[PDB]
Amino acid sequence: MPAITIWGRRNSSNVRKALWCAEEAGVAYTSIEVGGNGVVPTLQDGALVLWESNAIVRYLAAQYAPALYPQAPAERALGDRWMDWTTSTFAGVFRDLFWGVVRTPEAERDHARIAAALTQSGELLARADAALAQQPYLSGGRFAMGDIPLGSFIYAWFEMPIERPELPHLQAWYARLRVRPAYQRGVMTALT
Ligand SMILES: [Cl-]
Ligand SMILES: [Cl-]
Ligand SMILES: [Cl-]
Ligand SMILES: [Cl-]
Ligand SMILES: [Cl-]
Ligand SMILES: [Cl-]
């Protein structure tokens, strides 16, 4: 049994973050899920226990995948600002939309709240589309850990049966993310 364990459901965007990053590092790890652990993802590595997504991504990068963890604080800030932005500004907005269209059973849905989250999610993502029009990645010129938090959400953004606004840089960014095998293994899971 490996030293690293990741509790949590594989169809969670937060868990995709930890899984993808773990897959990006190459470490051996265990993924425990319940079918038919004090939080959405729980990362235990030795004595260390975390139940918070962007800190997990940030820890496994610094500890096992330093290419994803830029050494200069000023360079790190370019991508790190997008890690908190995903959590502070986009997640809650996007979580409602996703819950509306995939997880409430029938068309008995708050069609007004769903339509609201879609517009606001598009408005917010449009700001990330503008950043991706200046540099190829959220972390700068190369891919790094700053791309991982929104990258795990953007999978569900583009695969939901919703009417997306035209965000071409954001989509091209998503096209490059899918070339990464760790992304295919960590993020591109069944969109349940
Ligand atoms: Cl989601
Ligand atoms: Cl350790
Ligand atoms: Cl915590
Ligand atoms: Cl940028
Ligand atoms: Cl179109
Ligand atoms: Cl297109």
Side-chain angles (χ1 to χ4, degrees), residues 2-8 11-38 40-70 72-74 76-94 96-105 107 109-110 112 114-126 128-141 143-162 164-192:
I4 299 167
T5 300
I6 301 176
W7 281 269
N11 61 352
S12 170
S13 301
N14 289 337
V15 180
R16 293 186 167 113
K17 280 183 264 181
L19 288 181
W20 172 15
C21 184
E23 204 69 35
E24 275 290 336
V27 295
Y29 68 94
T30 295
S31 172
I32 296 175
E33 188 202 309
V34 188
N37 199 359
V40 200
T42 307
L43 190 272
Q44 184 176 354
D45 185 10
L48 174 63
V49 179
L50 312 156
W51 53 320
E52 189 68 45
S53 323
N54 296 158
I56 291 165
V57 172
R58 226 174 285 121
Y59 163 67
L60 296 168
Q63 181 59 194
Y64 302 110
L68 304 206
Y69 185 92
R76 197 158 68 239
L78 301 172
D80 198 9
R81 68 193 175 185
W82 286 107
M83 298 174 84
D84 312 323
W85 181 90
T86 292
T87 288
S88 77
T89 295
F90 178 73
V93 191
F94 175 81
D96 199 346
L97 172 67
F98 180 74
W99 264 85
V101 301
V102 170
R103 280 170 178 169
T104 81
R109 300 177 160 103
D110 187 337
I114 283 176
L118 177 59
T119 326
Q120 191 60 36
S121 316
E123 294 262 325
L124 290 177
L125 285 169
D129 178 89
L132 291 171
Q134 290 301 115
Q135 306 234 19
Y137 294 110
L138 299 172
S139 319
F143 167 86
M145 74 182 187
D147 289 85
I148 292 172
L150 190 54
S152 319
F153 276 101
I154 216 66
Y155 170 64
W157 168 257
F158 282 112
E159 305 302 328
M160 283 179 306
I162 66 168
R164 284 156 289 255
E166 312 292 310
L167 295 169
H169 307 86
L170 182 79
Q171 173 169 343
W173 175 66
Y174 177 50
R176 298 188 293 279
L177 289 181
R178 298 182 333 232
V179 185
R180 307 188 66 88
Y183 184 82
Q184 301 169 2
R185 289 190 295 272
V187 176
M188 297 182 71
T189 63
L191 198 66
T192 325

PDB file of all heavy atoms in Angstrom, residues 140-175, unseen atoms left out:
ATOM      1  N   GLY A 140       1.578  31.043 -16.721  1.00  0.00           N
ATOM      2  CA  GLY A 140       2.586  31.796 -17.442  1.00  0.00           C
ATOM      3  C   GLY A 140       2.819  31.289 -18.851  1.00  0.00           C
ATOM      4  O   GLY A 140       1.867  30.997 -19.585  1.00  0.00           O
ATOM      5  N   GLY A 141       4.092  31.182 -19.241  1.00  0.00           N
ATOM      6  CA  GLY A 141       4.416  30.688 -20.568  1.00  0.00           C
ATOM      7  C   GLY A 141       4.440  29.178 -20.655  1.00  0.00           C
ATOM      8  O   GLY A 141       4.152  28.611 -21.711  1.00  0.00           O
ATOM      9  N   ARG A 142       4.795  28.511 -19.569  1.00  0.00           N
ATOM     10  CA  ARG A 142       4.736  27.064 -19.490  1.00  0.00           C
ATOM     11  C   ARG A 142       3.555  26.653 -18.617  1.00  0.00           C
ATOM     12  O   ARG A 142       2.998  27.457 -17.865  1.00  0.00           O
ATOM     13  CB  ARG A 142       6.043  26.488 -18.926  1.00  0.00           C
ATOM     14  N   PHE A 143       3.155  25.393 -18.750  1.00  0.00           N
ATOM     15  CA  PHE A 143       2.138  24.832 -17.871  1.00  0.00           C
ATOM     16  C   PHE A 143       2.720  24.640 -16.475  1.00  0.00           C
ATOM     17  O   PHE A 143       3.898  24.308 -16.319  1.00  0.00           O
ATOM     18  CB  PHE A 143       1.631  23.505 -18.450  1.00  0.00           C
ATOM     19  CG  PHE A 143       0.809  22.681 -17.497  1.00  0.00           C
ATOM     20  CD1 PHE A 143      -0.557  22.901 -17.364  1.00  0.00           C
ATOM     21  CD2 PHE A 143       1.396  21.665 -16.755  1.00  0.00           C
ATOM     22  CE1 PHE A 143      -1.318  22.140 -16.496  1.00  0.00           C
ATOM     23  CE2 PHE A 143       0.641  20.898 -15.883  1.00  0.00           C
ATOM     24  CZ  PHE A 143      -0.719  21.139 -15.754  1.00  0.00           C
ATOM     25  N   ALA A 144       1.901  24.878 -15.455  1.00  0.00           N
ATOM     26  CA  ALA A 144       2.326  24.633 -14.080  1.00  0.00           C
ATOM     27  C   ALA A 144       1.086  24.505 -13.202  1.00  0.00           C
ATOM     28  O   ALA A 144      -0.044  24.439 -13.700  1.00  0.00           O
ATOM     29  CB  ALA A 144       3.277  25.729 -13.585  1.00  0.00           C
ATOM     30  N   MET A 145       1.304  24.485 -11.881  1.00  0.00           N
ATOM     31  CA  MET A 145       0.244  24.120 -10.946  1.00  0.00           C
ATOM     32  C   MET A 145      -0.927  25.091 -10.994  1.00  0.00           C
ATOM     33  O   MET A 145      -2.051  24.713 -10.643  1.00  0.00           O
ATOM     34  CB  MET A 145       0.793  24.044  -9.523  1.00  0.00           C
ATOM     35  CG  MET A 145       1.064  25.401  -8.905  1.00  0.00           C
ATOM     36  SD  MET A 145       1.766  25.313  -7.252  1.00  0.00           S
ATOM     37  CE  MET A 145       1.756  27.048  -6.787  1.00  0.00           C
ATOM     38  N   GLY A 146      -0.695  26.336 -11.419  1.00  0.00           N
ATOM     39  CA  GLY A 146      -1.775  27.307 -11.483  1.00  0.00           C
ATOM     40  C   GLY A 146      -2.878  26.927 -12.448  1.00  0.00           C
ATOM     41  O   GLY A 146      -4.013  27.392 -12.297  1.00  0.00           O
ATOM     42  N   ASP A 147      -2.572  26.081 -13.431  1.00  0.00           N
ATOM     43  CA  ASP A 147      -3.552  25.676 -14.427  1.00  0.00           C
ATOM     44  C   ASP A 147      -4.478  24.583 -13.924  1.00  0.00           C
ATOM     45  O   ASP A 147      -5.559  24.397 -14.494  1.00  0.00           O
ATOM     46  CB  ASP A 147      -2.834  25.195 -15.687  1.00  0.00           C
ATOM     47  CG  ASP A 147      -2.183  26.325 -16.444  1.00  0.00           C
ATOM     48  OD1 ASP A 147      -1.043  26.698 -16.102  1.00  0.00           O
ATOM     49  OD2 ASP A 147      -2.828  26.868 -17.358  1.00  0.00           O
ATOM     50  N   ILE A 148      -4.097  23.885 -12.861  1.00  0.00           N
ATOM     51  CA  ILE A 148      -4.784  22.669 -12.433  1.00  0.00           C
ATOM     52  C   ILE A 148      -6.169  22.954 -11.853  1.00  0.00           C
ATOM     53  O   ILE A 148      -7.127  22.265 -12.238  1.00  0.00           O
ATOM     54  CB  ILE A 148      -3.914  21.874 -11.446  1.00  0.00           C
ATOM     55  CG1 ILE A 148      -2.690  21.310 -12.170  1.00  0.00           C
ATOM     56  CG2 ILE A 148      -4.712  20.754 -10.809  1.00  0.00           C
ATOM     57  CD1 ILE A 148      -1.671  20.665 -11.255  1.00  0.00           C
ATOM     58  N   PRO A 149      -6.352  23.925 -10.944  1.00  0.00           N
ATOM     59  CA  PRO A 149      -7.705  24.109 -10.377  1.00  0.00           C
ATOM     60  C   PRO A 149      -8.774  24.440 -11.408  1.00  0.00           C
ATOM     61  O   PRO A 149      -9.822  23.785 -11.423  1.00  0.00           O
ATOM     62  CB  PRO A 149      -7.504  25.241  -9.357  1.00  0.00           C
ATOM     63  CG  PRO A 149      -6.072  25.133  -8.967  1.00  0.00           C
ATOM     64  CD  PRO A 149      -5.363  24.767 -10.242  1.00  0.00           C
ATOM     65  N   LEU A 150      -8.559  25.430 -12.277  1.00  0.00           N
ATOM     66  CA  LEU A 150      -9.582  25.711 -13.279  1.00  0.00           C
ATOM     67  C   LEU A 150      -9.648  24.613 -14.334  1.00  0.00           C
ATOM     68  O   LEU A 150     -10.725  24.337 -14.873  1.00  0.00           O
ATOM     69  CB  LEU A 150      -9.332  27.067 -13.938  1.00  0.00           C
ATOM     70  CG  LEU A 150     -10.464  27.583 -14.835  1.00  0.00           C
ATOM     71  CD1 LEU A 150     -11.798  27.599 -14.089  1.00  0.00           C
ATOM     72  CD2 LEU A 150     -10.130  28.957 -15.360  1.00  0.00           C
ATOM     73  N   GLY A 151      -8.512  23.974 -14.631  1.00  0.00           N
ATOM     74  CA  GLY A 151      -8.507  22.899 -15.606  1.00  0.00           C
ATOM     75  C   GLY A 151      -9.417  21.750 -15.219  1.00  0.00           C
ATOM     76  O   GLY A 151     -10.035  21.121 -16.079  1.00  0.00           O
ATOM     77  N   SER A 152      -9.524  21.465 -13.917  1.00  0.00           N
ATOM     78  CA  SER A 152     -10.442  20.414 -13.482  1.00  0.00           C
ATOM     79  C   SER A 152     -11.898  20.843 -13.616  1.00  0.00           C
ATOM     80  O   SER A 152     -12.775  20.002 -13.843  1.00  0.00           O
ATOM     81  CB  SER A 152     -10.135  19.999 -12.039  1.00  0.00           C
ATOM     82  OG  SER A 152      -8.740  19.928 -11.810  1.00  0.00           O
ATOM     83  N   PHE A 153     -12.183  22.134 -13.472  1.00  0.00           N
ATOM     84  CA  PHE A 153     -13.554  22.584 -13.658  1.00  0.00           C
ATOM     85  C   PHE A 153     -13.897  22.707 -15.132  1.00  0.00           C
ATOM     86  O   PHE A 153     -15.014  22.373 -15.541  1.00  0.00           O
ATOM     87  CB  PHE A 153     -13.775  23.918 -12.949  1.00  0.00           C
ATOM     88  CG  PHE A 153     -14.097  23.775 -11.501  1.00  0.00           C
ATOM     89  CD1 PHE A 153     -13.126  23.986 -10.541  1.00  0.00           C
ATOM     90  CD2 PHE A 153     -15.371  23.424 -11.094  1.00  0.00           C
ATOM     91  CE1 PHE A 153     -13.420  23.857  -9.198  1.00  0.00           C
ATOM     92  CE2 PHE A 153     -15.672  23.294  -9.747  1.00  0.00           C
ATOM     93  CZ  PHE A 153     -14.693  23.509  -8.801  1.00  0.00           C
ATOM     94  N   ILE A 154     -12.938  23.162 -15.940  1.00  0.00           N
ATOM     95  CA  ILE A 154     -13.210  23.448 -17.341  1.00  0.00           C
ATOM     96  C   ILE A 154     -13.613  22.190 -18.093  1.00  0.00           C
ATOM     97  O   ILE A 154     -14.322  22.271 -19.102  1.00  0.00           O
ATOM     98  CB  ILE A 154     -11.991  24.132 -17.986  1.00  0.00           C
ATOM     99  CG1 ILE A 154     -12.470  25.157 -19.005  1.00  0.00           C
ATOM    100  CG2 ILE A 154     -11.064  23.114 -18.618  1.00  0.00           C
ATOM    101  CD1 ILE A 154     -13.206  26.318 -18.384  1.00  0.00           C
ATOM    102  N   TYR A 155     -13.204  21.020 -17.603  1.00  0.00           N
ATOM    103  CA  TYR A 155     -13.664  19.772 -18.196  1.00  0.00           C
ATOM    104  C   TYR A 155     -15.183  19.691 -18.162  1.00  0.00           C
ATOM    105  O   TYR A 155     -15.831  19.492 -19.197  1.00  0.00           O
ATOM    106  CB  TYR A 155     -13.037  18.593 -17.459  1.00  0.00           C
ATOM    107  CG  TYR A 155     -13.618  17.256 -17.839  1.00  0.00           C
ATOM    108  CD1 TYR A 155     -13.478  16.762 -19.124  1.00  0.00           C
ATOM    109  CD2 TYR A 155     -14.296  16.481 -16.906  1.00  0.00           C
ATOM    110  CE1 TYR A 155     -14.005  15.536 -19.477  1.00  0.00           C
ATOM    111  CE2 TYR A 155     -14.823  15.251 -17.247  1.00  0.00           C
ATOM    112  CZ  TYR A 155     -14.673  14.787 -18.538  1.00  0.00           C
ATOM    113  OH  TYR A 155     -15.195  13.570 -18.891  1.00  0.00           O
ATOM    114  N   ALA A 156     -15.771  19.875 -16.978  1.00  0.00           N
ATOM    115  CA  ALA A 156     -17.223  19.837 -16.855  1.00  0.00           C
ATOM    116  C   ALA A 156     -17.876  21.014 -17.565  1.00  0.00           C
ATOM    117  O   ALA A 156     -19.015  20.901 -18.025  1.00  0.00           O
ATOM    118  CB  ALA A 156     -17.624  19.810 -15.380  1.00  0.00           C
ATOM    119  N   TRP A 157     -17.177  22.144 -17.671  1.00  0.00           N
ATOM    120  CA  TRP A 157     -17.753  23.294 -18.359  1.00  0.00           C
ATOM    121  C   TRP A 157     -18.031  22.976 -19.820  1.00  0.00           C
ATOM    122  O   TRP A 157     -19.093  23.323 -20.348  1.00  0.00           O
ATOM    123  CB  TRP A 157     -16.819  24.497 -18.250  1.00  0.00           C
ATOM    124  CG  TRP A 157     -17.208  25.613 -19.158  1.00  0.00           C
ATOM    125  CD1 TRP A 157     -16.623  25.948 -20.345  1.00  0.00           C
ATOM    126  CD2 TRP A 157     -18.278  26.541 -18.961  1.00  0.00           C
ATOM    127  NE1 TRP A 157     -17.259  27.029 -20.897  1.00  0.00           N
ATOM    128  CE2 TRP A 157     -18.280  27.414 -20.067  1.00  0.00           C
ATOM    129  CE3 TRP A 157     -19.234  26.723 -17.957  1.00  0.00           C
ATOM    130  CZ2 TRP A 157     -19.204  28.454 -20.198  1.00  0.00           C
ATOM    131  CZ3 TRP A 157     -20.145  27.755 -18.086  1.00  0.00           C
ATOM    132  CH2 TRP A 157     -20.126  28.608 -19.199  1.00  0.00           C
ATOM    133  N   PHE A 158     -17.099  22.304 -20.482  1.00  0.00           N
ATOM    134  CA  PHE A 158     -17.196  22.065 -21.915  1.00  0.00           C
ATOM    135  C   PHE A 158     -17.976  20.806 -22.273  1.00  0.00           C
ATOM    136  O   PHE A 158     -18.369  20.657 -23.433  1.00  0.00           O
ATOM    137  CB  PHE A 158     -15.789  21.987 -22.526  1.00  0.00           C
ATOM    138  CG  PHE A 158     -15.141  23.329 -22.734  1.00  0.00           C
ATOM    139  CD1 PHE A 158     -14.030  23.705 -21.994  1.00  0.00           C
ATOM    140  CD2 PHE A 158     -15.633  24.211 -23.678  1.00  0.00           C
ATOM    141  CE1 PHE A 158     -13.423  24.936 -22.194  1.00  0.00           C
ATOM    142  CE2 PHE A 158     -15.028  25.441 -23.880  1.00  0.00           C
ATOM    143  CZ  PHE A 158     -13.924  25.801 -23.134  1.00  0.00           C
ATOM    144  N   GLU A 159     -18.222  19.905 -21.319  1.00  0.00           N
ATOM    145  CA  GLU A 159     -18.907  18.647 -21.602  1.00  0.00           C
ATOM    146  C   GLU A 159     -20.346  18.614 -21.103  1.00  0.00           C
ATOM    147  O   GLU A 159     -21.037  17.613 -21.321  1.00  0.00           O
ATOM    148  CB  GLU A 159     -18.133  17.468 -21.002  1.00  0.00           C
ATOM    149  CG  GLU A 159     -16.682  17.387 -21.449  1.00  0.00           C
ATOM    150  CD  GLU A 159     -16.521  17.272 -22.957  1.00  0.00           C
ATOM    151  OE1 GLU A 159     -17.405  16.670 -23.611  1.00  0.00           O
ATOM    152  OE2 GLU A 159     -15.502  17.785 -23.483  1.00  0.00           O
ATOM    153  N   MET A 160     -20.816  19.662 -20.449  1.00  0.00           N
ATOM    154  CA  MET A 160     -22.214  19.707 -20.060  1.00  0.00           C
ATOM    155  C   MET A 160     -23.088  20.115 -21.242  1.00  0.00           C
ATOM    156  O   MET A 160     -22.682  20.938 -22.065  1.00  0.00           O
ATOM    157  CB  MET A 160     -22.428  20.700 -18.929  1.00  0.00           C
ATOM    158  CG  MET A 160     -22.010  20.226 -17.567  1.00  0.00           C
ATOM    159  SD  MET A 160     -22.320  21.560 -16.408  1.00  0.00           S
ATOM    160  CE  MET A 160     -21.418  22.876 -17.216  1.00  0.00           C
ATOM    161  N   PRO A 161     -24.308  19.567 -21.337  1.00  0.00           N
ATOM    162  CA  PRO A 161     -25.226  20.001 -22.396  1.00  0.00           C
ATOM    163  C   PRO A 161     -25.789  21.383 -22.106  1.00  0.00           C
ATOM    164  O   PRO A 161     -26.970  21.531 -21.778  1.00  0.00           O
ATOM    165  CB  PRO A 161     -26.314  18.924 -22.376  1.00  0.00           C
ATOM    166  CG  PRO A 161     -26.321  18.450 -20.960  1.00  0.00           C
ATOM    167  CD  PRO A 161     -24.902  18.527 -20.477  1.00  0.00           C
ATOM    168  N   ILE A 162     -24.934  22.402 -22.203  1.00  0.00           N
ATOM    169  CA  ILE A 162     -25.310  23.790 -21.973  1.00  0.00           C
ATOM    170  C   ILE A 162     -24.900  24.609 -23.189  1.00  0.00           C
ATOM    171  O   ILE A 162     -24.118  24.169 -24.033  1.00  0.00           O
ATOM    172  CB  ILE A 162     -24.670  24.369 -20.695  1.00  0.00           C
ATOM    173  CG1 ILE A 162     -23.150  24.453 -20.859  1.00  0.00           C
ATOM    174  CG2 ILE A 162     -25.036  23.523 -19.482  1.00  0.00           C
ATOM    175  CD1 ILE A 162     -22.459  25.266 -19.785  1.00  0.00           C
ATOM    176  N   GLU A 163     -25.441  25.821 -23.264  1.00  0.00           N
ATOM    177  CA  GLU A 163     -25.123  26.746 -24.347  1.00  0.00           C
ATOM    178  C   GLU A 163     -23.972  27.624 -23.877  1.00  0.00           C
ATOM    179  O   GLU A 163     -24.173  28.586 -23.136  1.00  0.00           O
ATOM    180  CB  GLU A 163     -26.345  27.571 -24.727  1.00  0.00           C
ATOM    181  N   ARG A 164     -22.761  27.281 -24.292  1.00  0.00           N
ATOM    182  CA  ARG A 164     -21.598  28.045 -23.865  1.00  0.00           C
ATOM    183  C   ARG A 164     -21.422  29.286 -24.740  1.00  0.00           C
ATOM    184  O   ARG A 164     -21.656  29.234 -25.949  1.00  0.00           O
ATOM    185  CB  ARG A 164     -20.337  27.181 -23.930  1.00  0.00           C
ATOM    186  CG  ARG A 164     -20.201  26.181 -22.795  1.00  0.00           C
ATOM    187  CD  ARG A 164     -19.328  25.014 -23.200  1.00  0.00           C
ATOM    188  NE  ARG A 164     -19.999  24.160 -24.170  1.00  0.00           N
ATOM    189  CZ  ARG A 164     -20.527  22.976 -23.878  1.00  0.00           C
ATOM    190  NH1 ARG A 164     -20.460  22.511 -22.638  1.00  0.00           N
ATOM    191  NH2 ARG A 164     -21.124  22.258 -24.823  1.00  0.00           N
ATOM    192  N   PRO A 165     -21.023  30.412 -24.161  1.00  0.00           N
ATOM    193  CA  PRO A 165     -20.603  31.547 -24.984  1.00  0.00           C
ATOM    194  C   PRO A 165     -19.265  31.264 -25.654  1.00  0.00           C
ATOM    195  O   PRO A 165     -18.494  30.405 -25.223  1.00  0.00           O
ATOM    196  CB  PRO A 165     -20.489  32.695 -23.977  1.00  0.00           C
ATOM    197  CG  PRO A 165     -20.219  32.019 -22.677  1.00  0.00           C
ATOM    198  CD  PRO A 165     -20.957  30.713 -22.720  1.00  0.00           C
ATOM    199  N   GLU A 166     -18.990  32.012 -26.723  1.00  0.00           N
ATOM    200  CA  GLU A 166     -17.758  31.820 -27.487  1.00  0.00           C
ATOM    201  C   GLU A 166     -16.570  32.313 -26.672  1.00  0.00           C
ATOM    202  O   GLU A 166     -16.435  33.515 -26.423  1.00  0.00           O
ATOM    203  CB  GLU A 166     -17.828  32.552 -28.823  1.00  0.00           C
ATOM    204  CG  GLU A 166     -19.106  32.316 -29.612  1.00  0.00           C
ATOM    205  CD  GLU A 166     -19.234  30.898 -30.119  1.00  0.00           C
ATOM    206  OE1 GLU A 166     -18.267  30.386 -30.731  1.00  0.00           O
ATOM    207  OE2 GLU A 166     -20.309  30.294 -29.893  1.00  0.00           O
ATOM    208  N   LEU A 167     -15.704  31.388 -26.254  1.00  0.00           N
ATOM    209  CA  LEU A 167     -14.485  31.706 -25.508  1.00  0.00           C
ATOM    210  C   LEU A 167     -13.334  30.932 -26.142  1.00  0.00           C
ATOM    211  O   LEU A 167     -12.914  29.885 -25.634  1.00  0.00           O
ATOM    212  CB  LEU A 167     -14.650  31.381 -24.023  1.00  0.00           C
ATOM    213  CG  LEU A 167     -15.694  32.235 -23.291  1.00  0.00           C
ATOM    214  CD1 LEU A 167     -16.013  31.683 -21.899  1.00  0.00           C
ATOM    215  CD2 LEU A 167     -15.227  33.679 -23.203  1.00  0.00           C
ATOM    216  N   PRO A 168     -12.787  31.433 -27.253  1.00  0.00           N
ATOM    217  CA  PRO A 168     -11.904  30.582 -28.067  1.00  0.00           C
ATOM    218  C   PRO A 168     -10.555  30.308 -27.428  1.00  0.00           C
ATOM    219  O   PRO A 168     -10.018  29.207 -27.594  1.00  0.00           O
ATOM    220  CB  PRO A 168     -11.764  31.372 -29.378  1.00  0.00           C
ATOM    221  CG  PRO A 168     -12.822  32.442 -29.318  1.00  0.00           C
ATOM    222  CD  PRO A 168     -12.988  32.751 -27.870  1.00  0.00           C
ATOM    223  N   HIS A 169      -9.976  31.274 -26.716  1.00  0.00           N
ATOM    224  CA  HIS A 169      -8.702  31.007 -26.056  1.00  0.00           C
ATOM    225  C   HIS A 169      -8.872  29.987 -24.942  1.00  0.00           C
ATOM    226  O   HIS A 169      -8.053  29.071 -24.798  1.00  0.00           O
ATOM    227  CB  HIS A 169      -8.107  32.304 -25.519  1.00  0.00           C
ATOM    228  CG  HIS A 169      -8.014  33.379 -26.551  1.00  0.00           C
ATOM    229  ND1 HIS A 169      -9.062  34.227 -26.837  1.00  0.00           N
ATOM    230  CD2 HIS A 169      -7.010  33.722 -27.391  1.00  0.00           C
ATOM    231  CE1 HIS A 169      -8.703  35.057 -27.800  1.00  0.00           C
ATOM    232  NE2 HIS A 169      -7.462  34.771 -28.154  1.00  0.00           N
ATOM    233  N   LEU A 170      -9.939  30.127 -24.156  1.00  0.00           N
ATOM    234  CA  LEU A 170     -10.221  29.165 -23.102  1.00  0.00           C
ATOM    235  C   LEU A 170     -10.378  27.758 -23.669  1.00  0.00           C
ATOM    236  O   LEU A 170      -9.891  26.783 -23.081  1.00  0.00           O
ATOM    237  CB  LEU A 170     -11.476  29.598 -22.349  1.00  0.00           C
ATOM    238  CG  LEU A 170     -11.934  28.748 -21.167  1.00  0.00           C
ATOM    239  CD1 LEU A 170     -11.109  29.051 -19.918  1.00  0.00           C
ATOM    240  CD2 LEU A 170     -13.421  28.986 -20.926  1.00  0.00           C
ATOM    241  N   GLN A 171     -11.031  27.635 -24.829  1.00  0.00           N
ATOM    242  CA  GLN A 171     -11.221  26.318 -25.427  1.00  0.00           C
ATOM    243  C   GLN A 171      -9.913  25.756 -25.973  1.00  0.00           C
ATOM    244  O   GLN A 171      -9.631  24.563 -25.813  1.00  0.00           O
ATOM    245  CB  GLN A 171     -12.278  26.387 -26.526  1.00  0.00           C
ATOM    246  CG  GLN A 171     -12.411  25.095 -27.315  1.00  0.00           C
ATOM    247  CD  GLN A 171     -13.630  25.079 -28.207  1.00  0.00           C
ATOM    248  OE1 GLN A 171     -14.541  25.880 -28.033  1.00  0.00           O
ATOM    249  NE2 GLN A 171     -13.642  24.179 -29.184  1.00  0.00           N
ATOM    250  N   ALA A 172      -9.108  26.590 -26.632  1.00  0.00           N
ATOM    251  CA  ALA A 172      -7.819  26.117 -27.126  1.00  0.00           C
ATOM    252  C   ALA A 172      -6.927  25.668 -25.977  1.00  0.00           C
ATOM    253  O   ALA A 172      -6.211  24.666 -26.087  1.00  0.00           O
ATOM    254  CB  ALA A 172      -7.137  27.211 -27.942  1.00  0.00           C
ATOM    255  N   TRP A 173      -6.953  26.416 -24.869  1.00  0.00           N
ATOM    256  CA  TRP A 173      -6.312  25.987 -23.631  1.00  0.00           C
ATOM    257  C   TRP A 173      -6.798  24.606 -23.215  1.00  0.00           C
ATOM    258  O   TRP A 173      -5.997  23.736 -22.849  1.00  0.00           O
ATOM    259  CB  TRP A 173      -6.609  27.015 -22.542  1.00  0.00           C
ATOM    260  CG  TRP A 173      -6.137  26.680 -21.163  1.00  0.00           C
ATOM    261  CD1 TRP A 173      -4.843  26.557 -20.739  1.00  0.00           C
ATOM    262  CD2 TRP A 173      -6.960  26.472 -20.008  1.00  0.00           C
ATOM    263  NE1 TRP A 173      -4.813  26.276 -19.397  1.00  0.00           N
ATOM    264  CE2 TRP A 173      -6.098  26.219 -18.923  1.00  0.00           C
ATOM    265  CE3 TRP A 173      -8.342  26.474 -19.786  1.00  0.00           C
ATOM    266  CZ2 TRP A 173      -6.572  25.958 -17.638  1.00  0.00           C
ATOM    267  CZ3 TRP A 173      -8.812  26.223 -18.502  1.00  0.00           C
ATOM    268  CH2 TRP A 173      -7.929  25.961 -17.449  1.00  0.00           C
ATOM    269  N   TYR A 174      -8.111  24.384 -23.278  1.00  0.00           N
ATOM    270  CA  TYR A 174      -8.668  23.081 -22.941  1.00  0.00           C
ATOM    271  C   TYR A 174      -8.214  22.006 -23.922  1.00  0.00           C
ATOM    272  O   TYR A 174      -8.036  20.845 -23.531  1.00  0.00           O
ATOM    273  CB  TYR A 174     -10.192  23.188 -22.893  1.00  0.00           C
ATOM    274  CG  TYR A 174     -10.924  21.898 -22.629  1.00  0.00           C
ATOM    275  CD1 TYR A 174     -10.569  21.071 -21.574  1.00  0.00           C
ATOM    276  CD2 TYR A 174     -11.990  21.521 -23.422  1.00  0.00           C
ATOM    277  CE1 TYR A 174     -11.253  19.891 -21.329  1.00  0.00           C
ATOM    278  CE2 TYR A 174     -12.678  20.356 -23.191  1.00  0.00           C
ATOM    279  CZ  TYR A 174     -12.311  19.542 -22.145  1.00  0.00           C
ATOM    280  OH  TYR A 174     -13.014  18.380 -21.925  1.00  0.00           O
ATOM    281  N   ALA A 175      -8.005  22.370 -25.190  1.00  0.00           N
ATOM    282  CA  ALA A 175      -7.539  21.395 -26.169  1.00  0.00           C
ATOM    283  C   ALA A 175      -6.114  20.952 -25.867  1.00  0.00           C
ATOM    284  O   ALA A 175      -5.761  19.784 -26.072  1.00  0.00           O
ATOM    285  CB  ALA A 175      -7.636  21.970 -27.581  1.00  0.00           C
TER     286      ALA A 175
END
